[model samples]
Target chain A: MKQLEDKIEENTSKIYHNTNEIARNTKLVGE
Target chain B: MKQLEDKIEENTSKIYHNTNEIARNTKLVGE
Candidate 1:
């Protein structure tokens, strides 16, 4: 259970970082 | 264990979607 939780947390962190990158790139694209 | 596995799957899906978004945005930004 703890391991699964950690996996979820790790995926969530990846999602967060990807979202931030998307936002920055979108801005660079002029929107 | 099943529930945690499901949660991890859900997070993984979110990460996948976010990654796709980031890739598209990065392309729009010209690299």
Candidate 2:
């Protein structure tokens, strides 16, 4: 159970980081 | 506002997919 939390945190942190980058990249191209 | 919603949705969807993959990968390595 403890391992589960750590695993979720590590990978999801990367996901959010990339996700934010995409949103920023697209926002840069906005109207 | 609409553009903001679309941006959030697209990015979050990818986040969910990658998060799911990570969870699956971690489960494979579990005790």
Candidate 3:
């Protein structure tokens, strides 16, 4: 349970970082 | 990049599954 929770949290962080990268790159392309 | 998007999607799926598991377990404990 604890391990699963940790994994979920880690994946959420990864998703957030990747989303940020995508937004930044998309904005760069648009500019 | 496409690769980054794919990675993000995969991680998102993992998070979904982990969340589902957590919910199910929590429900079982509550019952």
Candidate 4:
């Protein structure tokens, strides 16, 4: 319950997507 | 889109007014 990106990034790194990659895109596409 | 920025920004701001980008903040502020 601290950093939202840190929590989700950890799992995504192991799951199927790259943590920094998708997040970078997400940041690019964020409103 | 109203020029992105999830929280504050009431000026000649730079908003990433795309489909998905706008989608994210609209979900956030519930306007």
Instruction: Report the C-alpha lDDT of model 4 over A1-31, residue by residue, as the tens digit.
Output: 2354454445434433433444566676566
Which ten-residue region of model 3 chain A has the weakest summed lDDT?
A22-31
Cα-based lDDT at residue B31, candidate 2: 78
Q: Which interface RMSD values do the candidates have, in the order shown?
A: 1.3, 12.7, 15.5, 13.3
- Candidate 1 C-alpha lDDT tens digits along A1-31: 6787688778878977886887788679673
**lDDT of the structure predicted as candidate 1:** 0.78
Q: How well is each residue in B1-31 modelled by candidate 1, as lDDT tens digits?
A: 7876886798788778878877876876784
**Cα error, candidate 2, residue A1 (Å):** 40
TM-score of each: 0.71, 0.47, 0.50, 0.24
- Indicate whether candidate 3 or candidate 4 has the larger lDDT: 3
Cα lDDT tens digits, model 3, B1-31, are: 5565566568778766755655555455453
Q: Each candidate's lDDT (Cα)?
A: 0.78, 0.61, 0.62, 0.42
Model 2 residue A29 lDDT score: 48
Off by over 4 Å in 1: none
By DockQ thresholds, what CAPRI class is model 4?
Answer: incorrect
Candidate 1, Cα interface RMSD: 1.3
Pairs in steric clash, model 1: none
Off by over 4 Å in 4: A1-17, B1-31
Chain B only, TM-score of each candidate: 0.91, 0.72, 0.87, 0.38
| Candidates 3 and 4, the one with greater DockQ | 3
Badly placed stretches (over 4 Å) of model 3 are A1-31
DockQ of 4: 0.05
Per residue, candidate 3 scores C-alpha lDDT tens digits across A1-31 of 5655665578878667655655554565464
